[PDB]
Design a protein around this ligand. Structure first.
Ligand SMILES: Nc1ncnc2c1ncn2[C@@H]1O[C@H](COP(=O)(O)OP(=O)(O)OP(=O)(O)O)[C@@H](O)[C@H]1O
Ligand SMILES: Nc1ncnc2c1ncn2[C@@H]1O[C@H](COP(=O)(O)OP(=O)(O)OP(=O)(O)O)[C@@H](O)[C@H]1O
Ligand SMILES: Nc1ncnc2c1ncn2[C@@H]1O[C@H](COP(=O)(O)OP(=O)(O)OP(=O)(O)O)[C@@H](O)[C@H]1O
Ligand SMILES: Nc1ncnc2c1ncn2[C@@H]1O[C@H](COP(=O)(O)OP(=O)(O)OP(=O)(O)O)[C@@H](O)[C@H]1O
Ligand SMILES: Nc1ncnc2c1ncn2[C@@H]1O[C@H](COP(=O)(O)OP(=O)(O)OP(=O)(O)O)[C@@H](O)[C@H]1O
Ligand SMILES: O=P(O)(O)OC[C@H]1O[C@H](O)[C@H](O)[C@@H]1O
Ligand SMILES: O=P(O)(O)OC[C@H]1O[C@H](O)[C@H](O)[C@@H]1O
Ligand SMILES: O=P(O)(O)OC[C@H]1O[C@H](O)[C@H](O)[C@@H]1O
Ligand SMILES: O=P(O)(O)OC[C@H]1O[C@H](O)[C@H](O)[C@@H]1O
Ligand SMILES: O=P(O)(O)OC[C@H]1O[C@H](O)[C@H](O)[C@@H]1O
Ligand SMILES: [Mg+2]
Ligand SMILES: [Mg+2]
Ligand SMILES: [Mg+2]
Ligand SMILES: [Mg+2]
Ligand SMILES: [Mg+2]
Ligand SMILES: [Mg+2]
Ligand SMILES: [Mg+2]
Ligand SMILES: [Mg+2]
Ligand SMILES: [Mg+2]
Ligand SMILES: [Mg+2]
Lengths: 309, 309, 309, 309, 309
């Protein structure tokens, strides 16, 4: 079986970058809409006996992109692909991972069930909002981390990184920032709201680096940055793997004191970058390409958790 | 267990009509979108031990509405509803019911699988594009027919119906028109394309009635009507259960010779009716309400196949 | 169908308390071991058509108790019980809810799969370590909260509760303490380790109340209490729903400065209470009995999230 | 894919013997207990794309060992092993293979379901108590026989084997003894209880050889041996594949007239052999190693039913 | 059949509290007066096949409220309710339960007859003046007791309750006070008039607690309290289930030495509480709600005689 990479319509540039890193052309697929807006999918080449990877991020018109992904998986499965892998850099509905007191769906579990029944044998994703989502599946799920690329960016872009501070915006994700601070051998200052915020960790005259899994409306990072600037930090950075930037996010970032808002390209960023000068993108296509290549070859994927390829 | 009717966002007016016919209020549900356009669903009342019916048609923004339906089903299922029934008047992706020579998905089967894995115990739908779709499910599927309401409309609106002709637009659905002609005791003239059309059945100086399951772009019925008017039919009617009317449909209908284009309200029609004077709507809410009531009470549903309630 | 309550061997006293609150006798069941230590289960009365609840906590000899629960569920299912519900006050393997970087099982998901394949139609549990565990199931899961009973205990046992502080021991569970502080209208001081601990929130001359989901080795609460006593708190309390108290826990509690270590009786506590004078137990049998009664009667279970019955 | 052999904690020596016969080292795995006695499993090497065999017998602390096996299977499955095979020399709960008049579990079926849902693609076992247990699975099950090794032992250890008699202790397993007697070309004397026993087949002045699948409490073989010695047999042997020897078994064997009690090493025997001089062990590690090697290479496994490798 | 709760005009707040505890909305009913002051009742929703509970206490304008209750029962009965239950917390005309030497009506029996002929299938009431009134009916009557709530109030509000004394004001109801004293394990001092009063039971330097079924004009409790204060009781409390407080009652209570006059809310008390600072109310809505719920579900009501829900 050979690797076949197919792109959904959500993130074409990322799929092309992945395909170039693998020395492959993107598989021929027609992904459009019928007149009544139903998804139309046509696999333009035989996938019989091949190892198929479908790249689609949970961004943009999320329900359309998710339907397209499921329809593509189904088409490849009934076309006798030997294995079908969904490469989902940003997992849709990941924030609906529990009920907790409300008569609400667990939408992430529903998405996992739909991916399974569509025929996915394997999932590759990056920085799941909650790693318990891996347990929503019965098929293997490789949850990659942007952390090696983030560490590389910090070392090559922040001159005072040895004295900086790594700040979690909410108490929930402070595990990520502790791992990053341990890797950099720095202090991890913490922030949480009580309309007021409380911060532990000396930030005065230092650089503070907010790290989080995603920025949707940027309410979380803007409040944290306001707090940090209250406590005398010389500069504040925000680093996120998923740059969703919906709603009022671009205006809030423009009016905030961030030196830089760095995101990975798990979601296309060109349109947002046009309207916001302080957004910078870390390419993670090498990590995804290496994960695809290693799953195909039976090589260790977890080696990527700590190594930039 | 009591009947609880919940409406999705696709067809609120139909759900309200159904609820009024059952003497019930619509269940409290919040169905909206998060900032990043992910579906947000919140069941506003306990459904524990209840017989839940969720009304959502495959129309409008089809992928959003389908996701909303699946999320609502999941929310009701994990909220310990005794039974969950999807009331889907127009089944989405019904026209993708086979591959036939192409490397294509069977999207209708995927939709059936998704509805099943979401937790639906029962499906109620109207005039499935292909009744083989019933076999795509392992749960019971009640496929209702608009034919009794169509016959009622014909008898009360076409003065010359005893001399009229019932015409199938494509060879595929001529079964429907034969059933209708047998019920009315009239001739069924047939039409199919060879850019030219061929018609069997005397239509001269008579009324011809085109009957079909749906009109999407109205290419099918406009070509058939052109043929019929070539052969001297005094008036031509089109009657359809599903009035999708996407793309150039309204302009084609406006420029065509139809005396009337009658559709059921399985899909909301007010916006289309604003731009097209010859569209008339048959209310089928009584049929759906009776089907819901009979499934709840253990009464015969097939009795509705031949009786207007 | 009538309610039948069966007790596993793990927590007989809790099952008896539940049965008394429901006005029922415990169902006749023989639960012992064969000579080779395989679990032997014999249902001593017909359960045909009945609503069966099996009470077994994930405590003591956890693997034996889990096997016993699964075997009992299987016996009741193939004996034609109308419905089988596992009442698992402390869910076993709940702390193995993710992999996160290691080549490890997701044991909680395996347990959920085993409960499902054994035939459980419904799960009732209390204060799941991670509420995402609800998504590990496809059957409904009612995750009850000890919080109403905890609030009652605080109001009836701590004279200065209006001035007290609610302290989370680890950053992970601070959601619980924020909910409790909001209910009591008090400040929530927070603690996390950097062998040193950092605390936010005035605790001087006040009572601090540590709240957490469980105390296993009591390393978490003893370190937090040491920190709190460093910052001048007059008294320190610990309140937990699950009192596992394994390993060196009793000695650490005896040598710590806790005014009281309060636990619910989701796990039997008499043996631990013999060796530790500062352990007090909150009975939660009324909450479990009400949940059983409400699921049986189709009444709202979520009403218990905020109301002491 | 390469063979990877992992040992559970139940029978380490057997797993090592199997690994040596295959020219392999045992895979790195940490199998221990958390403080609260929950099983902790950590796969110490990548198994991605490998053919994994996990060796665990249903002996000792049976519920702990079964849980450990299931957790290991789950860990290997979600670590993207190409295939996972449970090598279970003595199948746990095999004697609970039916209900028969009692409101009892079919525990063997539950165990099969649990192994399947954990992710096992294949089962290798030896001398199932009832071969109908193979039908409890939907995955392939290779049920190996100790009979070739038993025949070899008889020919090399009993000088009068050409004149001996092969005796079934209970009527249920006389099929095994008929096969053995046919292979040796000897008479098969039979025994069954009516507190008295009845025997057919001349045993006077001869050697009698009791053959059975397992000896748990040794009540079965001791009663049969008492009967045989009543009828003048010069010596009595017992041969069993599974030497469970629980409860009073060692004392009964010590006080019985057996010349030898021979068991295979499907269960570790060193501790029992310390307290009982007449227990001898047949190594079956070559049979298990050959079965593993042949399943891996696509070679005939049934060839082992009649051939000692 | 579902529970439907309807409120009469007498005690709306109590009915609302009951409905909230049951998770229900009050049934739609118009209860007003025509111009000529005849009661007008209009049931605003179908009660066909439902289990109807009508809440109306014998207080305020007693004859109007009784007529309203009877008219509501009649309306629900001829509207084909499956069952109609009168929830009458304070039974009107209960003190006219006998003739005894006078040419007088037995008005309580007349009220029972009227309730029966109106169509009531069941009566729920609290602390009937004479429990023989239960025999005035041929339908079942559940006579609830305020005693559990009274005991709870005593334990949570009187610091010296272990040394207190429970005093009956008249010889007639001393049964209630003996039951209460037995529950509290205290002495029951007794009082009766000879314009002078005689008291048995040491009350000196102690708290005395008068307990009675009702306080109408408060002549009974004020005389008893005067006696108790003559004999040196440090404080005197009065506790009553029915706080009628008609005529000069408020002035007598204001001029009496009561530390507190505690009543249940079987009768609305806000207006009386405005004019009398020492009146406190025990909510008994949980007891009534539990009785309604248990009668509906076929659960034991007598369990409430000794248990606070
Ligand atoms: N796409 C979405 N956009 C915004 N909010 C969402 C979205 N999906 C779910 N939510 C809601 O957001 C909330 C989850 O918030 P969040 O993940 O930030 O915190 P948490 O899960 O409570 O805690 P933490 O992640 O810190 O452990 C829920 O109320 C959920 O319903
Ligand atoms: N939503 C859609 N809008 C338009 N075309 C669609 C849609 N879904 C599927 N199709 C395509 O339409 C075609 C199916 O057409 P149609 O159902 O009219 O005819 P058929 O199935 O070939 O025959 P018949 O229904 O007469 O037996 C397929 O090529 C299918 O891919
Ligand atoms: N029974 C157990 N006893 C002790 N440790 C366990 C047990 N089961 C799992 N663990 C281990 O404990 C760790 C989980 O710890 P814990 O739940 O306290 O923190 P977390 O999940 O990392 O974060 P948090 O709960 O604060 O969000 C994992 O390494 C897991 O393997
Ligand atoms: N681990 C165990 N130890 C002892 N007895 C067990 C064990 N598991 C099950 N049993 C019980 O042992 C009995 C089964 O006995 P056994 O297998 O010897 O005979 P059988 O199945 O009735 O007949 P046969 O095997 O001769 O055809 C059942 O009553 C079963 O419940
Ligand atoms: N609503 C009322 N208000 C006042 N007095 C009433 C009322 N209804 C009846 N009565 C009268 O009150 C008397 C009953 O008094 P009460 O119940 O206190 O004592 P009893 O029945 O004689 O004895 P006991 O209740 O101590 O065994 C009768 O004379 C009766 O006519
Ligand atoms: O609230 P938003 O800023 O839109 O979303 C970003 C944050 O909200 C969620 O918890 C994410 O994990 C981030 O921490
Ligand atoms: O082609 P369109 O007019 O858009 O769609 C309407 C017809 O096309 C499909 O076969 C339907 O069943 C109808 O017969
Ligand atoms: O570490 P232990 O004290 O044994 O276990 C108790 C804590 O560890 C886990 O995170 C629990 O949720 C508690 O917060
Ligand atoms: O009764 P035990 O001696 O403990 O167990 C050994 C026998 O019991 C079972 O039938 C086995 O198959 C053996 O025949
Ligand atoms: O005389 P009132 O104080 O008005 O009425 C209260 C008492 O009178 C009746 O016997 C009641 O049962 C009470 O004991
Ligand atoms: Mg979250
Ligand atoms: Mg967050
Ligand atoms: Mg078709
Ligand atoms: Mg057609
Ligand atoms: Mg955890
Ligand atoms: Mg914790
Ligand atoms: Mg057997
Ligand atoms: Mg046997
Ligand atoms: Mg009286
Ligand atoms: Mg009295």
């Amino acid at each position: 079986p050979n690797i076949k990479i197919f792109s959904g319509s959500s993130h074409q540039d990322l799929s092309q970058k992945i395909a170039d890193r693998l020395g492959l052309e993107l598989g021929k697929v027609v992904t459009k809409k019928f007149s009544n807006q139903e998804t139309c999918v046509e696999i333009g080449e035989s996938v019989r006996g091949e190892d198929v990877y479908i790249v689609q991020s949970g961004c943009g018109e999320i329900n359309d992109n998710l339907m397209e992904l499921l329809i593509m998986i189904n088409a490849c499965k009934i076309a006798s692909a030997s294995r079908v892998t969904a490469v989902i850099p940003c997992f849709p509905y990941a924030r609906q991972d529990k009920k907790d007191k409300s008569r609400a769906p667990i939408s992430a579990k529903l998405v996992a069930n739909m991916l399974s029944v569509a025929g996915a044998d394997h999932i590759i994703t990056m920085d799941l909002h909650a790693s318990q989502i891996q347990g929503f599946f019965d098929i293997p799920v490789d949850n990659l981390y942007a952390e090696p690329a983030v560490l590389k960016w910090i070392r090559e872009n922040i001159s005072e990184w040895r004295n900086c501070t790594i700040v979690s915006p909410d108490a929930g994700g402070a595990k990520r920032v502790t791992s990053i601070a341990d890797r950099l051998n720095v202090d991890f200052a913490l922030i949480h709201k009580e309309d007021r915020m409380v911060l532990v960790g000396d930030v005065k005259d230092r650089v503070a680096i907010l790290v989080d899994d995603m920025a949707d409306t940027c309410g979380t990072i803007c409040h944290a940055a306001d707090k940090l600037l209250s406590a005398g930090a010389t500069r504040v950075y925000a680093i996120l793997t998923h740059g969703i930037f919906s709603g009022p996010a671009i205006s809030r970032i423009n009016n905030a004191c961030f030196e830089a808002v760095v995101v990975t390209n798990t979601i296309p960023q060109e349109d947002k970058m046009k309207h916001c000068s302080k957004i910078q993108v870390i390419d993670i296509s090498m990590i995804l390409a290496e994960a695809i290549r290693r799953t195909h070859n039976g090589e260790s994927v977890s080696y990527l958790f700590s190594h930039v390829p």
